[PDB]
């Protein structure tokens, strides 16, 4: 189970395109990494809870303590009840996670469809040489408002008029 999780986590880390500029998810990444390191250390360094009296008791002759330690470990194995209660704030965080994640998936999907339609009707039709000004006026009326505002203010040479076009100042 850990193998697939590590695969997906590392793939996400190396495939970050709009998932940069982070401050805490990498912190959780190192938290998980050191948690797994502690797991591995505990498995490789598993000391023997019960006393190995089969081969160790014969070593001691005047023990006077092996029974005491045996009883102490016998009464210590149930240290306490495991928490296993990651279902009060983690669950709420996750619920919000999938909810607004589906919301974002829907919005990015419809944005992609809108952009595709924009490209399609930009490049497939609408020639510009035969385009009429009335079509531009009916498509968008803010140009009319711009004309009102620079006529009333009386500035007919607002910067950015013919720099990219032809002035053709013959005289």
């Amino acid at each position: 189970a850990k193998s697939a999780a590590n695969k997906l986590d590392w793939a996400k880390v190396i495939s970050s395109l709009r998932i940069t500029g982070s401050t805490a998810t990498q912190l959780s990444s190192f938290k998980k990494r050191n948690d797994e390191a502690r797991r591995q250390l505990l498995e490789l360094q598993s000391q023997p809870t019960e006393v190995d009296f089969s081969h160790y008791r014969s070593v001691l002759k005047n023990t006077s303590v092996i029974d005491k330690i045996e009883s102490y470990v016998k009464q210590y194995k149930p240290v306490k009840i495991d928490a296993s209660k990651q279902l009060q704030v983690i669950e709420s965080f996750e619920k919000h996670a999938m909810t607004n994640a589906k919301e974002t998936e829907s919005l990015v999907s419809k944005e992609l469809k809108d952009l595709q339609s924009t490209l399609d009707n930009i490049q497939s039709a609408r020639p510009f040489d035969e385009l009429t000004v009335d079509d531009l006026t009916k498509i968008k009326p803010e140009i009319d408002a711009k004309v009102e505002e620079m006529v009333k203010k009386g500035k007919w040479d607002v910067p950015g008029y013919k720099d990219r076009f032809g002035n053709l100042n013959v005289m």
Binding site: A5, L8, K12, R18, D35, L60, A83, F93, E94, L115
Partner: protein
């Protein structure tokens, strides 16, 4: 450019969800690691008094 910048949050959302839940559960299940670690320490102490 807008298209190929936007077109990333389609197959990565599920990966984000699964990584988030897996990382959070692994972080918050450290109680098992703590219990195993304290049991290991006490077993090591018992073995230590044994060789002492």
């Amino acid at each position: 450019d807008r298209i190929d910048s936007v077109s990333q949050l389609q197959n990565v959302a599920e990966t984000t969800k699964v990584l988030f839940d897996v990382s959070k559960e692994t972080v918050e299940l450290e109680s098992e690691a703590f219990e195993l670690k304290q049991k290991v320490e006490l077993a090591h102490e018992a073995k230590a008094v044994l060789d002492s």
